[PDB]
Design a protein around this ligand. Structure first.
Ligand SMILES: Nc1ncnc2c1ncn2[C@@H]1O[C@H](COP(=O)(O)O)[C@@H](O)[C@H]1O
Ligand SMILES: Nc1ncnc2c1ncn2[C@@H]1O[C@H](COP(=O)(O)O)[C@@H](O)[C@H]1O
Lengths: 344, 344
């Protein structure tokens, strides 16, 4: 282990909400959605929520003030009352925060940080500071789910952030959705239609392997390549890579190119295994498979275990991936597990 | 200066053709196109052309044998009779040659190497070896133009590779084209339709600047980010960046993302200026300008000289960009110049 595992959460703890990417949470027509997400944090998990100063000032201000976003993060980390930090939503430009990050402030204040998509960049901030962050649900997409939170997501939050015992095997969700239901309050009493889930798919591999988790949104990780934010070499040794595709539905060819680059970096050659999240709307589901298996064939990595269609990324519900945690891919059973606690 | 400048070309010299990317040149229905290109090298420039052993074995073989492609390049460089090397065509997977390149062989054998698009990777082979290469025309796309080569392209070959005098100002071409005329022999007698060219556009900047050239195909450069092929930091200081978009017409959003990454690397903050090639078919011509100016605005670089719509990239005709050569953007006149010879 080379990342600090933060302290477990419990009822009464204060959680901070932040907008390091898109600042729509503060927009007039969206605010209701944010408040809905806060409600579940307070009622289902018994937590106290506090928005950081600049977090709800709207999308226009947020976009024009990357420094203000950084200040919000630093404030949350440097406040010892804050036991956890949760992103409101992803976006596309959180990379602009890099010049304003005091990594030492993160290093000196280990605590839970969670989010996904463009929040991958913020996870890399933590990662560089030697802090294990959590690739998981955000306020507006998961906690603010209309009518009721998904029991699957709730369970995984409990198991990951409220328990210092081994997470164990991650079962596949029974249902999933990526249906677009506009975030206007007129729809708050409307449930999203669910789709039956078929489970995980083993694309290749014939062995049981263990490695430490690293990765995120495959599109956003590209933003950090070549930068000082990219993880040091040792973080890629004996790893379990995890990738998920965003809502832009990246064309299959780009997956191929991006994976080719991971081979050019020597990353795929060091991996113990790889896991892929369900594509949003299951778009390019079969096409991505082709591109992935092709790259492995190109670099003689056809024995590398790859698990597909996992419940993380841009579909609901989702489980949580702690960065740096020991994970397992059992090819014989086609199962996936996390072999330790997410928190102390 | 850090890159070695190769010796000037002249009639009687031997030129090697290579397929470091797509191996179509050897394909039955394309071979004629290769031979037509060779014909111009012989008759227009008085050069002897020799294909490398694996360069014409077809697209299937070449795709499956990246090591064979590498060996072809090493052969050409290490053969002291070969005074120049020209890529047949681009592609998308020349990054796969990386583990098979002997950079020392390139170092000990300075000579002309030219091509564009996916050949950018091969330029980075030369670059890492400290050899100045030439972002310029290829066999199948330029030297094999039906009926006759564009005088503009011929002029730039002569001014860059046959003269050891200063290249000087690069005037814009009077006409341009990117019309898809199938490379089947039945079309050899058909000219491609030309479009009037309107000249360069200054997107921003108000001061004359000078710096050394570095860049290539913006999509292909992403393939090398994070790898040991990426040029060292010193090469990016006081440089003139040059980018051009490929035939796949990359969505404007990706131009923004990619340019955001250059800022995240600190490259844009080091540049003296930037030049962009005419997009293929002028697709996203206006859209790209918006994305470029947005990124400059995000990172407070609205004074950085940016010249737009130059005659290099995936349109014909072309001029040639020698890596590492001193170049100039004159904002007063909106002109572009290369302030030294391309060859010794
Ligand atoms: N105004 C909106 N109404 C409903 N859903 C939205 C809205 N804006 C964004 N979303 C969804 O929220 C997701 C957030 O993804 P990300 O920004 O990657 O975290 C998007 O992919 C959309 O599916
Ligand atoms: N069989 C073909 N017939 C006509 N044009 C082609 C053919 N194959 C490739 N091209 C063109 O050649 C260029 C290839 O780009 P690159 O591979 O980047 O050099 C593009 O402009 C293609 O449209």
């Amino acid at each position: 282990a080379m990342l600090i595992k933060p302290k477990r959460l419990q009822a009464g703890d204060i959680v901070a909400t932040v907008s390091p990417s898109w600042g729509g949470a503060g927009d007039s027509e969206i605010r209701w959605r944010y408040e809905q997400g806060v409600k579940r944090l307070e009622e289902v998990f018994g937590l106290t929520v506090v928005p950081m100063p600049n977090s709800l000032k709207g999308s226009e201000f947020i976009y024009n003030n990357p420094q203000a976003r950084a200040e919000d993060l630093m404030t949350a980390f440097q406040d010892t009352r804050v036991k956890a930090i949760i992103a409101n939503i992803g976006g596309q430009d959180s990379i602009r925060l890099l010049p304003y990050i005091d990594f030492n402030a993160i290093r000196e204040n280990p605590k839970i940080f969670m989010g996904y998509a463009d929040v991958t960049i913020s996870h890399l901030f933590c990662h560089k500071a030697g802090l294990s962050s959590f690739y998981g649900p955000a306020i507006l997409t998961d906690f603010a789910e209309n009518v009721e939170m998904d029991p699957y997501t709730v369970e995984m939050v409990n198991r990951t952030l409220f328990s210092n015992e081994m997470i164990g095997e991650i079962q596949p969700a029974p249902e999933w959705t990526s249906e677009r239901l506009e975030w206007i309050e007129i729809n708050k009493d409307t449930r999203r239609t669910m789709q039956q889930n078929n489970g995980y798919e083993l694309l290749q591999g014939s062995t049981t392997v263990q490695g430490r988790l690293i990765g995120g949104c495959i599109e956003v990780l590209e933003f950090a390549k070549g930068t000082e934010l990219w993880p040091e070499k040792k973080h890629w040794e004996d790893s379990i890579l995890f990738f998920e595709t965003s809502e832009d539905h990246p064309e299959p060819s780009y997956i191929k190119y991006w994976l080719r680059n991971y081979a050019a970096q020597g990353i795929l050659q060091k991996a113990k295994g790889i896991i892929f999240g369900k594509p949003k709307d299951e778009m390019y589901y079969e096409e991505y498979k082709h591109e992935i298996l092709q790259v492995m064939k190109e670099h003689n990595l056809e024995d590398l275990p790859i698990l597909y269609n996992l419940n993380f990324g841009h579909t609901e519900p989702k489980f949580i991936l702690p960065y740096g945690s020991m994970a397992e891919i059992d090819c014989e059973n086609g199962s996936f597990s996390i072999l330790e606690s997410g928190v102390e």
